[PDB]
Amino acid sequence: LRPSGTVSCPICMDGYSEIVQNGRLIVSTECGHVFCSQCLRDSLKNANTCPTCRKKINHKRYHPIYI
Amino acid sequence: RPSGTVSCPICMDGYSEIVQNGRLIVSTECGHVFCSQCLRDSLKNANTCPTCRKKINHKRYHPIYI
Ligand SMILES: [Zn+2]
Ligand SMILES: [Zn+2]
Ligand SMILES: [Zn+2]
Numbered sequence: 001l002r003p004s005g006t007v008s009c010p011i012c013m014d015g016y017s018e019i020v021q022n023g024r025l026i027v028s029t030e031c032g033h034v035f036c037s038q039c040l041r042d043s044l045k046n047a048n049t050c051p052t053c054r055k056k057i058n059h060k061r062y063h064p065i066y067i
Numbered sequence: 068r069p070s071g072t073v074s075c076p077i078c079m080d081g082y083s084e085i086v087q088n089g090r091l092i093v094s095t096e097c098g099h100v101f102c103s104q105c106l107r108d109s110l111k112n113a114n115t116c117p118t119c120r121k122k123i124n125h126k127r128y129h130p131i132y133i
């Protein structure tokens with residue numbers, strides 16, 4: 001059982017207290033998707049995208065300049 | 068309220084009260100959580116997080132060194 005309206009990680013299936021009492025953090029992507037810190041890091045080892053919605057969660061900070 | 072409560076500290080509305088009435092839970096980049104409406108309201112007159120006061124309005128311009 002995984003009630004709607006509760007904080008949990010969809011990867012490891014751990015709830016809020018299980019996550020924080022083990023020394024992990026709750027994290028969010030910028031697209032609003034919530035994970036535990038360990039699961040999202042493990043995910044980003046094999047992919048640059050959000051596990052949930054697959055939006056790119058890397059951002060390279062450079063841009064064209066027009067002289 | 069207690070650890071694991073998703074609520075806005077400004078209006079004090081709990082999770083259910085926020086999302087069911089067309090607002091959203093929002094987080095600043097500094098990890099601080101509010102309802103969409105209270106955070107937006109605060110950002111109309113200040114550029115900083117209401118909780119930790121980190122500046123959270125970026126500057127989409129910068130020097131270029133040529
Ligand atoms: Zn997890
Ligand atoms: Zn996402
Ligand atoms: Zn609020």
Ligand SMILES: [Zn+2]
Pocket residue numbers: 095097098099116117118119120121
């Ligand atoms: Zn903050």
